[PDB]
Design a protein around this ligand. Structure first.
Ligand SMILES: Cc1cc2nc3c(=O)[nH]c(=O)nc-3n(C[C@H](O)[C@H](O)[C@H](O)COP(=O)(O)O)c2cc1C
Ligand SMILES: Cc1cc2nc3c(=O)[nH]c(=O)nc-3n(C[C@H](O)[C@H](O)[C@H](O)COP(=O)(O)O)c2cc1C
Lengths: 217, 217
């Protein structure tokens, strides 16, 4: 159970074995990972859809019918398929909700601590929706962080997965009633076990040398 | 069971033990982690700065001014500090860097297949920097994905870390001459070991209930 090995061994599955499914335990482990991911000020500006039924994966895959047909198969054949969603705008409600939760779990000693945490959360939230007018992308950024967390996490569970950015968010939004609830699709991640039609399992892993992307000071 | 415990036990350390440094192997491991993270089309539109010296860390801490004082401590007290940077504009010279390392690592069986990815990568990049004119946030989204992978990874190594968004991007960029190289800092991640002053090490992890963030279908 060494994380580097799993980091060097994991890959983007290009073909899933429709027959091999997720344990009801692994199915639970998948939702736990999504939920427990960190976020700026613990804003958790996301929403997830975890397709488990063929009727569900088809609903999702329905967004890959365009010029992303090669992606369609990964969706339908994989055990579970999660489509990460980000909030469209950071509202005062979601903010009150987060702090009310942190309080419910006992993260505040005095009511003054609770207030100081809320003012700090609103400081950052405001500099985004009021100063820089980027709360939508700031929120989308955290969702991606959640994905990086997820990809490594499932890989460490001995599961295969692949981050799909090639899909019509517009079609997916409409198909699930998103945007109405204040959300958008950003990444689709089919999870399960790979089949022999997956070429990327035999191919070596590649990244640019550290002498180009990294500076030590 | 394995990464899940890691995921639920990890926390945003608020105070570091300066004397507690990373072991020689741990230092190489965090670097590997930064390197093998996935990214859309394997574009790796990122750059990292790892400060391990006392001089390096102070230079990064320079960005912890104004209303970001509460983060200066962690940037100096932590064993190593990683500055996550994204490219400011995706140019063909880099798309050529990626494809050349993929060809060199032995992923392409036929020269037709290499030209097949170059086109795939280009088409994806083209619709971002031309049509939507948002390649700056697209590359930035990839960096956050890398951070998520990093946060869980260092935690799996038994290391402490806190993702910092509270710093001055201009000071960090200027202090390192990033704009001229084509980069901008997004997230700062000091990593080492927590001190007993870390009030967050003993506090309970708070997250929203799954009945709000997750829709199982
Ligand atoms: C992108 C990002 C930026 C953050 N910025 C800061 C920061 O500037 N300073 C800090 O002390 N914590 C920062 N946090 C830590 C969050 O408050 C923390 O991740 C969140 O409350 C969840 O707590 P946990 O990491 O203990 O699970 C940041 C987290 C993320 C993901
Ligand atoms: C955000 C994102 C989007 C990607 N889009 C796709 C996609 O639509 N289809 C696909 O097969 N792979 C996709 N990839 C997988 C990448 O090509 C892959 O992560 C990269 O080549 C590095 O290889 P690895 O995943 O084996 O480490 C994507 C990856 C990420 C992180």
């Amino acid at each position: 159970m060494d994380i580097i090995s799993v980091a060097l061994k994991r890959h983007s599955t290009k073909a899933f074995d429709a027959s091999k499914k997720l344990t009801p335990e692994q199915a639970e482990q998948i939702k736990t990972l999504l939920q427990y991911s960190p976020s700026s000020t613990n804003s958790q500006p996301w929403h997830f859809i975890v397709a488990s039924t063929e009727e569900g994966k088809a609903r999702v895959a329905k967004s890959a019918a365009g010029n992303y047909v090669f992606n369609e198969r990964k969706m339908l054949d994989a055990s579970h398929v999660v489509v990460f969603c980000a909030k469209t705008a950071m509202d005062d409600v979601w903010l009150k909700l987060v702090v009310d939760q942190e309080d419910a779990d006992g993260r505040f000693a005095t009511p003054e601590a609770k207030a100081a945490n809320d003012k700090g959360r609103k400081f950052f939230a405001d500099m985004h929706r009021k100063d820089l007018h980027d709360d939508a992308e700031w929120m989308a950024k955290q969702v991606y962080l959640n994905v990086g967390n997820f990809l490594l996490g499932v890989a460490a569970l001995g599961l295969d997965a692949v981050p799909i950015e090639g899909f019509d968010a517009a079609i997916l939004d409409a198909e699930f009633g998103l945007k109405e609830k204040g959300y958008t699709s950003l990444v689709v991640v089919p999870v399960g076990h790979h089949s022999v039609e997956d070429f990327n399992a035999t191919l070596p892993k590649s990244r640019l040398p550290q002498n180009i992307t990294l500076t030590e000071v």
